[PDB]
Amino acid sequence: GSHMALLVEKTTSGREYKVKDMSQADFGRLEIELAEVEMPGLMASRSEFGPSQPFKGAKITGSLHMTIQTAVLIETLTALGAEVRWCSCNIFSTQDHAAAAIARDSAAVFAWKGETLQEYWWCTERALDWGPGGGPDLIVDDGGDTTLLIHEGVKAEEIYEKSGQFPDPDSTDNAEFKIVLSIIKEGLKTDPKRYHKMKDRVVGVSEETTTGVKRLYQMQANGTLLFPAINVNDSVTKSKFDNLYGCRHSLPDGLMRATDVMIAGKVAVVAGYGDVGKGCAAALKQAGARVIVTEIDPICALQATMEGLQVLTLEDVVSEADIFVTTTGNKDIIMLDHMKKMKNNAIVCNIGHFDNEIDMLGLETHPGVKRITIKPQTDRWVFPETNTGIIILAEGRLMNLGCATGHPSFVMSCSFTNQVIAQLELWNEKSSGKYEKKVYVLPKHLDEKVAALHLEKLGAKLTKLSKDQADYISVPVEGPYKPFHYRY
Amino acid sequence: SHMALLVEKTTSGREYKVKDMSQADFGRLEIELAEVEMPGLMASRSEFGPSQPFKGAKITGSLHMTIQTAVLIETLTALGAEVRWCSCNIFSTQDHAAAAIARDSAAVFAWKGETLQEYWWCTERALDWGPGGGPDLIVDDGGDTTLLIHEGVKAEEIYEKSGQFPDPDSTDNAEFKIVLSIIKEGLKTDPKRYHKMKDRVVGVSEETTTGVKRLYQMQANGTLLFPAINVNDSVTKSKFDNLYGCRHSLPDGLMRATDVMIAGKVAVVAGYGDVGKGCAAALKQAGARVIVTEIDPICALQATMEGLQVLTLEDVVSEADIFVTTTGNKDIIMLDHMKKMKNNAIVCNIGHFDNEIDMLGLETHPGVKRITIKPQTDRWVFPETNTGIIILAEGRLMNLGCATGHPSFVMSCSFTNQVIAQLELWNEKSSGKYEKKVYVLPKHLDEKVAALHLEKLGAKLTKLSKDQADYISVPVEGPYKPFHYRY
Amino acid sequence: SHMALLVEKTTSGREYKVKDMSQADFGRLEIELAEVEMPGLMASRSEFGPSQPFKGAKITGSLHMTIQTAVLIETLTALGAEVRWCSCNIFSTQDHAAAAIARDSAAVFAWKGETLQEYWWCTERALDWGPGGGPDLIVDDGGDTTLLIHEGVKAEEIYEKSGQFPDPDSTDNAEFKIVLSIIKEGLKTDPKRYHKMKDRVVGVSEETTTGVKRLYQMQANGTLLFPAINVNDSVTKSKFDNLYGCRHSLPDGLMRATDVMIAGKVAVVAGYGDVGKGCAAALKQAGARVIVTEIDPICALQATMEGLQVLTLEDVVSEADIFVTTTGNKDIIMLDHMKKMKNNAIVCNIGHFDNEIDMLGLETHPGVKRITIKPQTDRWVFPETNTGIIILAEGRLMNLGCATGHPSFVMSCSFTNQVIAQLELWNEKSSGKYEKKVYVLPKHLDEKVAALHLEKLGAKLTKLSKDQADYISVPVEGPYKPFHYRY
Amino acid sequence: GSHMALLVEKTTSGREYKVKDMSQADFGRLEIELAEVEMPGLMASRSEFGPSQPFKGAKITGSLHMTIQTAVLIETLTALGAEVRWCSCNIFSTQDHAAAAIARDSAAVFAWKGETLQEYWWCTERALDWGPGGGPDLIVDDGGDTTLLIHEGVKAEEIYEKSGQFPDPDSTDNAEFKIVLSIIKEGLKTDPKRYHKMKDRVVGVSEETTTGVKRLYQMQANGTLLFPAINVNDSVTKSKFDNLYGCRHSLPDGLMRATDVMIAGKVAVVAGYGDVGKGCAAALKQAGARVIVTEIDPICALQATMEGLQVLTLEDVVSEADIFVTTTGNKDIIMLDHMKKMKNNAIVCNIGHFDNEIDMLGLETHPGVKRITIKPQTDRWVFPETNTGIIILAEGRLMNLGCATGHPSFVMSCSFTNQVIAQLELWNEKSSGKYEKKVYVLPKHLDEKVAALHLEKLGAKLTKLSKDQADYISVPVEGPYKPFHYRY
Ligand SMILES: NC(=O)c1ccc[n+]([C@@H]2O[C@H](COP(=O)([O-])OP(=O)(O)OC[C@H]3O[C@@H](n4cnc5c(N)ncnc54)[C@H](O)[C@@H]3O)[C@@H](O)[C@H]2O)c1
Ligand SMILES: NC(=O)c1ccc[n+]([C@@H]2O[C@H](COP(=O)([O-])OP(=O)(O)OC[C@H]3O[C@@H](n4cnc5c(N)ncnc54)[C@H](O)[C@@H]3O)[C@@H](O)[C@H]2O)c1
Ligand SMILES: Nc1ncnc2[nH]cnc12
């Protein structure tokens, strides 16, 4: 094979991995130990469920961003008896010391910060490739790439089984999808029933993020979804916490690490005002920026105005603003056309799941443009027309994870305790038909439980309803406390 | 009270009972200002006026009888409705609004400072369409009009068979004794009043969380007599009026009633739902240190993320300067709590009903003394301590009781939803689309409400390309969010 | 006006003129509440009451005649002073406060809604200690009482020599014509009134930025007749009342006058000094998008750091919903600006004098029409456009004119400084310590004011060890900051 | 000499330096170029004054923290004709790439991140040691260490000149001062009139920070101050901007980089509520912490309460709080006694100038304590009594600079344009007696000018007074606009 072939390494115990630097394991462990204290829902899950080993025999593939927080999640799964293989769901989001500690101590991990796209897809394939004993039984996904690979893999395998044909990247004009089809092609040479076996064994997927869940609904709508899915993003204790308060923390962190720019006194544009945009706008306003929101949804627009934020189209503000943040989960928000109008050293970043919110393709092909790397994940692109630049963060990829460390532990404990519950539910319920090849959410009493598990850490003292009071508001003393449609 | 509970009539023969008709010109002046602040309602008049969709309809409403409600009423009449109205609280009426409506537009039975007897008499009047019958449609806020009809029908069933009347001795609740006595008296005049009424009612649209709770109870126990639209739980109602409206009107109520500085104080907000979020926001933004009480661990955790301490009432009762109940529950602030409060602690309620605070225990505490500072600000002094507390609006919703409730712009959001709900029920009167259950308006209409309010504020919306719309799986024209989206 | 400008007298012979003495009981009730909120004043009564330091003193004040000022007045009288008072603005009096004071404690000449003639007559009355002479001491807010004395002395000098009177034709300013006519009339009765007065005045303590500006002008031109203490520039005045007080009372004024939703609007704050900072804070915290105008690049830069846009008025005149002038300057919002404003834009002033907004240009605009919505809320409609603007309190300080001004707690800070200033001037009356110049209170007393207000709020101060105190070069007991510290 | 002797290196042009890694110069230049855009007051100073070379012939020693921002300041001094030698005023505050770029391109620099105290004082001595041509003429100081060394050097030289005696570290129990006296002792062997010559030549010092200015007043009060001083800290455009808004930026940056802890939901204690404490409290509250302030000054305490913050003594909250930040400029704020009461993983940091706000001496000698370094400048100290830890940032040294990058460029341009003005004034005015051996502040019209220079960058449009309006408020159309005693 190739001089530069990607090859798995093995620990002294024989577990596969590929990480940046295994010498970083001790440092990873140190920060993991700190995180544990900040993640009471995960630690409570270990205490409650560890002894009964509910995941005994289960094989779990995950793609949550390979951070210290994810490390605590992984080690909760393993504490509960799972065997685990992991990759990151973005080329820039891995924390190398986290990856090293997990590789050393707990799970197969294929992840490093600064992957090429070919490396990224290879790592995804590896995390899914359990070899002859088969697997996974369970998938934890963030953004849907792992789920996509499986669905596209089954499709390719069907064509191969019927007609002998391999995928051909020439068939697509999308550069990344060419890589995907190439991975699949090569994988047919090693195990051309890989994905069919998986299709038959996988109990379900638990999906972390808004973009991933949109993809799940597309597959359900078109009748292609192969196994049950739990939508973790839309737990209240996920969407209304991680997406909002997480970003309120990690947006400014990414800006400050990447650029050190003063936010106070600047004009910042936030495209989108969903959960992520709300948290980003909040951080920016809190820091002393004057925040302008773009929106397509009149309800979200009206919310922004109630918070004292101006709502305009991008075109209205492109020449004036200092910082741009895309939060939409859509595509084509900041185009080359917009970039050409920006002031010198305008900062352009994306915090939505995929980089196509920003027109990186257009930028890279703009005649005469010059990319000057300031430092990793801070790039100044100089427009020749003006001899002025724009500062792109993380090549348009999720800026919080790419330029900083993403969300903090405490809020990730809320998201990831939902993940643990979701995994437990899929595994425990596998032999009714509680779950069809459809998208489900966790029940409210479990959503409430996640919150309840995090109150003591913060010293929050909850009031107990009397029986009379609970009757009066039509709820049980132990909850759930809100109607099905409650929005919080 | 100097009020005689006999209807008056306009020159045209339309009934009313208000405090002072001389206030009508002033009412009109403030309505004229409110119209500019209520573009959703004005847009509704322009869109639907030519077709007069409420031609021939008879509508009873109970929305608080404010300037804002006047604009709603006059939207209904601009669209062809004949209207009778009452307030849903004894202290929430704005007398000038009532006067202008009574004079110009609709039958109104409402004044600020009703007794409970007067309150229930007004409710009966608003429902009394005379021999001809009615209402066709009900607009309710808190469910008292809906309650009266359901309890009336129940009493009429028993009466028809056994001749038994409701007996007020059956309840120790002073206000419910009044309701049972009103039902008894109505049996003695027309034992089928409410049976006939319920058979003619096309539906009710309900404004507020407490009222919608009641509706869901009636649906669950199979007693609900007619379709209901839950207006509260439109996004453009619950996450605007309940939240931002209270953020405005809570401090307004506090300032008018007491003039107390909020900055530097400790304020307790009991509950952290939509109302409690708005109330806590106002207090914190005014420089108070806010402590939240909650039963729901999700809401509690939200409060902590906003930098608020979450404790039980018992932990802070002697420390706090201001107490605000927002729960929609009962028995939040009891006499036992009151007795521990510092001198001149301010106690108020902004939930729908006054039983959040233990007025009964207060009023019956041996040796207690009430000194009225001014209307709706009372200082109660305890004999044990010789210190006092300040109760606002006798525990009734303080924002409406001590100030003017929410402002026009936010009420335009709420009330545009009410227009849409009323139009839906009425247009569908003969179609069988709605069963005797509780419905919410569809998302495209919730979005329309928002969209109607953007121009006023200069908010400029982006349009999706078809490619972008496809990418996120929505139509270019919406709706833009999944059914279970929480905003 | 129905007011007869003839003094009334109490049973005891003390003069007054108020709107309605029947309001005294209500005044008393609200004063009793205010006392609990004003610990600095109450502490002053406890500390100094036994020694009666103002025994035999005659004090004239012009503080706005509110409940808060009533507590100040009754601190002065608790300490032995005899007091005469007027308000320093035509719309700022609270009639119940005035009544209670008139009845119980001091001569008061004040009502809400004075004409300018009445305003100046009240000022003369507050200064009129009869043949015996007085005042010994003046409490001023904005400098009009001080002005009258200085202009009076000037006119008396000319009169004594040439018999010439002030001629109102010498000014085109309608209000200054009233002042010159009052001086003329007083020459015709007692040509040495103000000469005698100035020789007896121990000093003045001045409350507000505009008043202190005037004092510094008089010092600079050598006309200042007596010592003055600048109370405004105590830290515990300027950086509390002017800032936090307006943060409270600006939204109060807006809400009472108009009930408009602030959230979602664009609001312009002209000026970003202490008052503009507080006003902008309130508006932003209420959900308005605030645009600041400024002439001072430091203040402008501060605003930007707070996330506010800084533009000129001309850039935003047609966009903003609410305009608030805070400058202490003149000619901020002119007729030319008004004409460009959207229908029902709200225009108000919270600086000391109404000439921040061009009332004269408005009132004299051909074909303009004023429609009073209610007292202190006027809608002016222009003939060119047939659209209107809403002027609050005819351009007079809106917080006091449309609401109740600042709350008691913050006014206790301001007014404890006034007590200290008055005690200093009076105790030093015969010592020659103060020249005919403007003085500020020393830092240890500024700190004492703060310290007197901490217990109320439960704020617990740390004590320096002697080693720590030495390390930062301060005494354990303070003062804790260098002379030029800005806080 | 010693195997591990600290020795100056020289550039290819012969200029002295000692930095961590000269290969970092290119990276420093890249970030310097970005900073320049964010520092319009400094760049305007270059444009206005560059051609006239006002500092021709002047030698300037500085000790401003050796950051990218300071690099822009240094290169403004050199653009204006100065020769410059520099050190950092804290062992952890240097940005190594900034130091390298300056060393390479513009000035002698003795600075690295992670200096020992002996290295720190050596670098201070080197920055002051111009060799046989003499110098400096001018000093820019932050915290007063450079000024202290000169004053203590003159004292030692007087004793040496009169009585032949050298300093003896045994004479002091203060470990750091032993190092100082040792430096001075050794320096007497190379030039025993170094400091006397300086005393005679130095035109003045411009002092950056509150602690430094307190020291200057002590020397003025005791009649020991040797040369004029300009107090830059107390320009309005310094104290009310850098100390406040700078810390509002850089406090949370330091916490997030050092620990990644979620601030939202926590209890944070801010000791002191001066300018720095106001900005720190603001950041913490803005981020969703519940902030408790400690104060000795009743005015500052009352301010805090008006902002909705609880004011308590440290003892009231030590067992409950999650984060502690000292802001006092005092000493002995957080003692070992307090530390022993803190919860597991409480974060303890200092943002005041000197580390003695926190009882590091007491901590280090606590029986059985164990220091576990998580990563540089994040240390977990484990108390044996409880088997719980506290997290100390930057060994108690200024946490914003030690754990992150300190303040951002834009606000430092305000501080440092004051520095430029101060230096120009001292140099230009040296031959009257405008300036005695006393502490002075810059006049208000120059303070205003600093602000005015930063408005256009932010798009802020200032109104011009009419002549009539300016008369009415008793100010000139061109300012100054406020009375001498105005507090802003
Ligand atoms: N980086 C992180 O740590 C992180 C955390 C959570 C979620 N995510 C991702 O962030 C993205 C947003 O998630 P969310 O939960 O806020 O979704 P959301 O659906 O709640 O909000 C997205 C918003 O974008 C608006 N929008 C869509 N197209 C737009 C356009 N062309 N211009 C302006 N506004 C437009 C929508 O109206 C909507 O309100 C998703 O990709 C999600 O997966 C990232
Ligand atoms: N890290 C940075 O970037 C940075 C920036 C500016 C200033 N500084 C430094 O920060 C420190 C504070 O500066 P400042 O300008 O805020 O000073 P300041 O004098 O304005 O404020 C310090 C405050 O601490 C309070 N205080 C003193 N002793 C106390 C005690 N024992 N407990 C509680 N409070 C106490 C004082 O009352 C005062 O209000 C100084 O050392 C200064 O040099 C650091
Ligand atoms: N102003 C108002 N009018 C009617 N209902 C309301 N509910 C809250 N405020 C109100």
CA distance A73 to A418: 11
Block residue for tokens 């509110």:
C66
Q: Would you say C273 and D483 are in contact if contact means Cβ atoms under 8 Å apart?
A: no
From CA C273, how far away is CA C250, in angstroms rounded?
A: 15
Residue D175: how many CB atoms within 10 A of its CB? Answer: 10
CB of D195 closer than 8 Å to CB of D154 = yes
Write out the catalytic residue numbers of B.
64, 87, 92, 141, 207, 232, 237, 241-242, 246, 352, 406, 414, 418
Q: Please identify every residue of C annotated as catalytic.
A: 64, 87, 92, 141, 207, 232, 237, 241-242, 246, 352, 406, 414, 418
Ligand 1 within 6 A of CB of A405: no
> Would you say B367 is a known binding-site residue?
no
Closest ligand 3 atom, CA of B241? 8
Ligand nearest the Cα atom of residue B87: 3
Pocket test for ligand 2, best of D328, D338, D401 (most atoms within 8 A of CB): D328
CA separation for the pair C171, C183 (Å, rounded): 14
Task: Of B324, B320, B313, give the one whose Cα is nearest residue B393.
Answer: B324
The count of other CB atoms within 10 Å of the CB of residue A162 is 8
Q: How far apart are CA D327 and CA D338, in angstroms?
A: 17
- Using DSSP, state whether C253 is helix, strand or coil: helix
C-alpha torsion C162→C167→C171→C173, nearest 10:
140
Sign of the torsion formed by the C-alpha atoms of A351, A352, A354 and A356: negative
Residue C273 DSSP symbol:
S
Residue in A with minimal Cα distance to B483: A485
- C-beta atoms surrounding A430 within 10 Å: 16
Distances (CA, A) of A185 to A2, A7, A125, A153: 17, 18, 12, 9
Q: What are phi and psi of B122, to 5 degrees?
A: -60, -40
* Domains (range + CATH), chain C: 1-242+406-459 (3.40.50.1480), 243-405 (3.40.50.720)
DSSP alpha helices (H): ranges in D129-262? Answer: 145-163, 175-188, 194-201, 210-221, 236-238, 247-259
> Is residue B251 within 8 Å of B282, Cβ to Cβ?
yes
CB atoms < 10 A from the CB of A370, how many?
12
Q: Please, are residues C320 and C338 in contact by the beta-carbon 8 Å criterion?
A: no
Q: What is the DSSP letter of D422?
A: H
Q: Is C350 annotated as a binding residue?
A: yes
Q: Which of A244, A276, A303, A315 to mutate to test the pocket of ligand 1 (most atoms within 8 A of CB)?
A: A276
**Cα A45 to ligand 2 centroid, rounded to whole Å:** 44
Contacts of D392 (CB under 8 A, 6+ apart): D348, D349, D358, D360, D363, D379, D380, D381
Q: Are strands D83-87 and D108-110 parallel, antiparallel or unpaired?
A: parallel
The β-bridge relationship of strands D370-375 and D378-383 is antiparallel
CA distances from A144 to A206, A353, C262 (A): 10, 10, 43
Closest Cβ opposite residue A451 in set B298, B450, B454: B298
Q: Give the helix/strand (H/E) hosting C179.
A: helix C174-187
**Helix B274-285 and helix B297-305: axis angle, to 10°?**
20
Which residues touch A267 (CB under 8 Å, ≥6 apart)? A289, A290, A291, A292, A317, A320, A321, A322, A323, D459
Are D362 and D338 in contact, with CB atoms under 8 Å apart? Answer: no
Q: What is the spatial distance between Cα D444 and Cα D426, in angstroms, rounded to a whole number? A: 16
Across A156-280, where does the E strand assignment appear?
Answer: 204-207, 229-231, 267-271
Closest CA to B135 of B212, B60, B40, B207: B60
φ and ψ of C30, to 5 deg: -75, -35
Amino acid at D5: A
In 3-state terms, what secondary structure has residue B91? Answer: coil
Annotated catalytic residue within A129, A145, A242, A322: A242
The position carrying tokens 């930062």 is C472
Among B242, B411, B412, residue to substitute to test ligand 3 (most atoms within 8 Å of Cβ): B411
Residue of B98, B96, B97, B91 whose CA lies nearest to B112? B91
Element (H, E) at C371: strand C369-374
| Torsion from C-alpha of C289, C293, C296, C300, nearest 10 degrees | 20
C293 touches chain D (CB under 8 A): yes
User: Phi/psi zone of residue A253: left (φ > 0), alpha (ψ -120 to 50 degrees), beta?
Assistant: alpha
Q: C260 C-alpha to center of ligand 3: Å?
A: 13
Q: Where are the beta strands (DSSP E) in B37-129?
A: 58-61, 82-86, 107-109
* Closest C-alpha to D414, from D73, D93, D59, D46: D73
Instruction: Give Cβ neighbours of residue C336 (< 8 Å, ≥ 6 apart).
Output: none
Q: What is the CA(D231)–ligand 2 centre distance, in A?
A: 16
Residues with CB under 6 A from ligand 2: C 462, 464, 468, 472, 480; D 209-211, 242-243, 246-247, 271-277, 294-297, 300, 327-330, 333, 351-353, 398, 400, 406-407
What is the three-class DSSP state of D371? strand
Q: Is A90 left (phi over 0), alpha (psi -120 to 50) or beta?
A: beta
B261 touching D, CB under 8 A? Answer: no
- Which residues of chain A from 315 to 334 reach within 8 Å of chain D, CB to CB? 320
| Disruptive mutation site among A262, A286, A290, A303 for chain C (greatest number of C CBs within 10 Å) | A290
Judge whether A352 is annotated as a binding position.
yes
